[PDB]
Design a protein around this ligand. Structure first.
Ligand SMILES: O=S([O-])[O-]
Ligand SMILES: O=S([O-])[O-]
Ligand SMILES: O=S([O-])[O-]
Ligand SMILES: O=S([O-])[O-]
Lengths: 110, 110, 110, 110
């Protein structure tokens, strides 16, 4: 429906607002800098501190992104209802190194 | 021409690359975090440290943006050739507070 | 008295504790990183962001230190009772550039 | 000798200077903020990012301090000659959580 799409867009906007108020927040070498929405997508922008780690663990950042969002009760409900999360991770130079959609399908077996 | 547009797009991409290598760089309460390009536009993303200043001097940020880009010899040449700069400034929460194009016209009397 | 010295030492320790809980806090190009006590002295350690300003305004940092502590109602009372503040400011390299006692006498005419 | 003590004090001062020029530098959740000397001691002050980790791994910070300084060719030579390193680690609040001497004896079996 148009009404279900409208509801998801309003949910994505509200949830981006809620999460924005607490920024920036660090989780080890990740610093969450910016949260936005677009349609039914919550966009999470983080700096991965390449300067501090001397590493670029792309595989690990992706696998831990999928598992952490999927295992969060609130995000998992949101995904199943039709919200999607877009995870953008930049290195210390601000260069984009990960740009990955997490959807309800991401959490399912395949 | 198609060739002049192609040249400006290649210039915007190269110049975004050059400036990215030095990031992040601070200019008082501004921290330049990310530089990108799109077509003939160099996009400059900065955090204005609202937490540290307790202020939101929107007028000042805009007037000093126009004057600083216009008065830079290299940027002024680039603007006159057809490159444009897009200045995006976020507060401490990552919320967008300025999104302003600077073009060759920005430097002229009116 | 021994008892008045003991009271001032306990006050300096408690006040260092109170202020520590809120750190780090920025005031423009100053970042308060560490607060300690020693006897009747509250020690305030800040980084002055020499990298961001490209300046070392020693005179200004000293005059604004004396005036800001002297004009604060709580600090002014504390100073008059016999507490002292030691202001240590380091540059971006962590090198000590100011180490200045502020006492009750600092606020008086001379 | 007085001359060997003087040589170690001059070495500690010079080495503190050398290391200061590169600050701040991050090694994962450690940020080296300040390096000083006192007599034959190089003092290393770091922030351990308790806010980002949600942990206080005191044992690990101490064991990895001893092993990293002992296993560094230059530091190991310096220690054997009579220089000592004092490792001070503060949490996110600037509160001192580790203050540990590393000496030539630290690297030996016992
Ligand atoms: O890693 S996801 O499938 O839970
Ligand atoms: O402020 S611009 O017109 O130089
Ligand atoms: O500057 S002090 O004397 O208030
Ligand atoms: O851990 S130290 O003994 O090399």
């Amino acid at each position: 429906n148009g009404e279900k799409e409208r509801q998801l867009e309003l949910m994505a906007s509200n949830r981006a607002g809620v999460l924005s108020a607490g920024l920036p927040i660090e989780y080890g070498p990740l610093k969450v800098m910016r949260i936005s929405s677009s349609k039914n997508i919550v966009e999470i922008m983080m700096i991965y501190n390449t300067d501090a780690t001397g590493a670029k663990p792309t595989q690990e950042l992706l696998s831990t992104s999928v598992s952490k969002y999927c295992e969060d009760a609130t995000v998992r409900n949101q995904l199943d209802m039709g919200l999607m999360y877009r995870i953008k991770i930049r290195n210390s130079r601000g260069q984009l190194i990960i740009d990955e959609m997490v959807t309800a399908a991401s959490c399912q077996p395949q």
